[PDB]
Scaffold this active site. Structure first.
Site, PDB file in Angstrom:
ATOM      1  N   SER A  61      10.815   2.478 -10.054  1.00  0.00           N
ATOM      2  CA  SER A  61      12.474   1.988  -9.374  1.00  0.00           C
ATOM      3  C   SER A  61      12.461   1.550 -10.628  1.00  0.00           C
ATOM      4  O   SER A  61      14.119   1.032 -10.040  1.00  0.00           O
ATOM      5  CB  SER A  61      11.774   1.639  -8.058  1.00  0.00           C
ATOM      6  OG  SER A  61      11.503   2.444  -7.128  1.00  0.00           O
ATOM      7  N   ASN A 340      -0.452   0.370 -11.533  1.00  0.00           N
ATOM      8  CA  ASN A 340       0.418  -0.721 -10.137  1.00  0.00           C
ATOM      9  C   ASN A 340       0.018  -1.729  -9.351  1.00  0.00           C
ATOM     10  O   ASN A 340      -1.114  -1.284  -8.464  1.00  0.00           O
ATOM     11  CB  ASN A 340       0.759   0.573  -9.422  1.00  0.00           C
ATOM     12  CG  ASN A 340       1.378  -0.242  -8.303  1.00  0.00           C
ATOM     13  OD1 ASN A 340       2.140  -1.198  -7.448  1.00  0.00           O
ATOM     14  ND2 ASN A 340       1.465   0.511  -6.798  1.00  0.00           N
TER      15      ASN A 340
HETATM   16  C1  LIG Z   1      10.083   2.665  -7.182  1.00  0.00           C
HETATM   17  O1  LIG Z   1       9.308   1.537  -7.751  1.00  0.00           O
HETATM   18  C2  LIG Z   1       9.306   3.517  -6.028  1.00  0.00           C
HETATM   19  N1  LIG Z   1       8.475   3.750  -5.921  1.00  0.00           N
HETATM   20  C3  LIG Z   1       7.790   5.325  -5.520  1.00  0.00           C
HETATM   21  O2  LIG Z   1       8.477   4.873  -4.847  1.00  0.00           O
HETATM   22  C4  LIG Z   1       6.484   5.780  -6.116  1.00  0.00           C
HETATM   23  C5  LIG Z   1       5.174   5.374  -6.118  1.00  0.00           C
HETATM   24  C6  LIG Z   1       5.127   3.958  -4.595  1.00  0.00           C
HETATM   25  C7  LIG Z   1       4.286   2.976  -5.323  1.00  0.00           C
HETATM   26  C8  LIG Z   1       3.896   1.887  -3.797  1.00  0.00           C
HETATM   27  C9  LIG Z   1       3.885   1.961  -2.741  1.00  0.00           C
HETATM   28  C10 LIG Z   1       5.615   3.518  -2.923  1.00  0.00           C
HETATM   29  C11 LIG Z   1       5.521   3.908  -3.450  1.00  0.00           C
HETATM   30  N2  LIG Z   1       4.545   5.827  -6.358  1.00  0.00           N
HETATM   31  O3  LIG Z   1       4.784   6.999  -7.012  1.00  0.00           O
HETATM   32  C12 LIG Z   1       6.556   6.924  -7.158  1.00  0.00           C
HETATM   33  C13 LIG Z   1       7.756   7.157  -7.649  1.00  0.00           C
HETATM   34  C14 LIG Z   1       9.513   2.352  -4.534  1.00  0.00           C
HETATM   35  N3  LIG Z   1       9.939   1.278  -5.562  1.00  0.00           N
HETATM   36  C15 LIG Z   1       9.262  -0.270  -5.451  1.00  0.00           C
HETATM   37  C16 LIG Z   1       9.605  -1.203  -5.556  1.00  0.00           C
HETATM   38  O4  LIG Z   1       8.973  -1.872  -6.503  1.00  0.00           O
HETATM   39  O5  LIG Z   1      11.038  -1.553  -5.215  1.00  0.00           O
HETATM   40  C17 LIG Z   1       8.294   0.242  -4.277  1.00  0.00           C
HETATM   41  C18 LIG Z   1       7.248  -0.337  -4.665  1.00  0.00           C
HETATM   42  C19 LIG Z   1       9.104  -0.071  -3.493  1.00  0.00           C
HETATM   43  S1  LIG Z   1       8.288   2.193  -4.105  1.00  0.00           S
END
Ligand SMILES: *C(=O)[C@@H](NC(=O)c1c(-c2ccccc2)noc1C)[C@@H]1N[C@@H](C(=O)O)C(C)(C)S1
Length: 358
Positions: A61, A340
């Site tokens: 993100s 992550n």
């Molecule tokens: C961006 O980093 C987004 N990521 C995702 O949607 C995502 C995940 C994920 C990890 C953890 C929780 C939910 C989803 N796995 O693959 C993808 C493509 C969102 N932004 C992040 C941020 O740190 O701002 C999250 C963790 C809030 S989700």
């Protein structure tokens, strides 16, 4: 590096890697404007390939910061306006709930409860139209923030329409190339595949899967050097020679909405500096990050404030990233890891480094 930078970085990051069992990490500190690099561990555990300054990581993100700047650049070119209704740029979007929803709302997660992810079942263009047509907002526009890849991703796709360029082509030609980010990619080219780290999720090597609006929300891959260059550009936008790009950087760091101590930019999020570290550390936790939060419109938006902690977190299934910078202090950090691990641990480490150097 000055020994001081070396020591603060190592004494922070070495335990972080040990406690979180991160296989590979790269860090850049920008100190009085100059970048200093640090690497640990493995890009590819099976092939015993180390992390280097050329290793690609999935930004997740953090990609949104590039989307927000690219939109900013489109606004500065006069191709789009944030005050434009969404339907101006997607006339097939005829559903009544879209009346009143602007590009600003999409960009800032305030459209009225668009969901965190575009559903996995959305596989085509007509599936995407159906999804947005049939979405039912919980809230009026501009009242509550709900972090959403489906929100900023649609902004990104719409923002590039008038150019006639695809999102990827616009991004390369208008942001990456002018900034000399020559090892930053939406689709990793075969020439760079040997530098593409594996992500690790429960011990398995994984890369991000294709998904609708992935490029716009979470699809950038980059090296620690290019990301340091990205921090430098966002620290000092007025040094960039491309007029519209310099302005798009500024526009992405403008404060549109406030929820607590946090201000929402385009991609970037900001807090007044100095910052209370419990604000950012605990705020980064995903139960807080992803909650529905009432917002106050900043009318009109505050232009980029130099006395700010400007930051963004990101994750994919196999990677965790963080970027933070303080324009007033010419100071910033990038942390890229191929696991992550929890946001608060990222933000705590970052603040420990930057607070030491400040
Ligand atoms: C961006 O980093 C987004 N990521 C995702 O949607 C995502 C995940 C994920 C990890 C953890 C929780 C939910 C989803 N796995 O693959 C993808 C493509 C969102 N932004 C992040 C941020 O740190 O701002 C999250 C963790 C809030 S989700």
């Amino acid at each position: 590096a000055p020994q001081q930078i070396n020591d603060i970085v190592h004494r922070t990051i070495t335990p972080l890697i040990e406690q979180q069992k991160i296989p590979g990490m790269a860090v850049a500190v920008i100190y009085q404007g100059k970048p200093y690099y640090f690497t640990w561990g493995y890009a590819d555990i099976a092939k015993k390939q180390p992390v280097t300054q050329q290793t690609l990581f999935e930004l997740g993100s953090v990609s949104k910061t590039f989307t927000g700047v690219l939109g900013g650049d489109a606004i500065a070119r006069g191709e789009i306006k944030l005050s434009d209704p969404t339907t101006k740029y997607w006339p097939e979007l005829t559903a009544k709930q879209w009346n009143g929803i602007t590009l600003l709302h999409l960009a800032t997660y305030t459209a009225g409860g668009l969901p965190l992810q575009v559903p996995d079942e959305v596989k085509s263009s007509s599936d995407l139209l159906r999804f947005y047509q049939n979405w039912q907002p919980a809230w009026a526009p501009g009242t509550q923030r709900l972090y959403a890849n489906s929100s900023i991703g649609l902004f990104g796709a719409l923002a590039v329409k008038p150019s006639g360029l695809s999102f990827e082509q616009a991004m390369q030609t208008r942001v990456f190339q002018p900034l000399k980010l020559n090892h930053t990619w939406i689709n990793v080219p075969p020439a760079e595949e040997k530098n593409y780290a594996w992500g690790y999720r429960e011990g398995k090597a994984v890369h991000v899967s294709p998904g609708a609006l992935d490029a716009e929300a979470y699809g950038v891959k980059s090296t620690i050097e290019d990301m340091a260059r990205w921090v430098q550009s966002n620290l000092k936008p007025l040094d960039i020679n491309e007029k519209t790009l310099q302005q798009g950087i500024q526009l992405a760091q403008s404060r549109y909405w406030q929820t607590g101590d946090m201000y929402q930019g385009l991609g970037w999020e900001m807090l007044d500096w100095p910052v209370n570290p419990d604000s950012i550390i605990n705020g980064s936790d995903n139960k807080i990050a992803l909650a529905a939060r009432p917002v106050k419109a900043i009318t009109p938006p505050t232009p980029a404030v130099r006395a700010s902690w400007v930051h963004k977190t990101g994750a994919t299934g196999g990677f965790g990233s963080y970027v933070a910078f303080i324009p007033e202090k010419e100071l910033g950090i990038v942390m890229l890891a191929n696991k992550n691990y929890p946001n608060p641990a990222r933000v705590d480490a970052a603040w420990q480094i930057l607070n030491a150097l400040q």
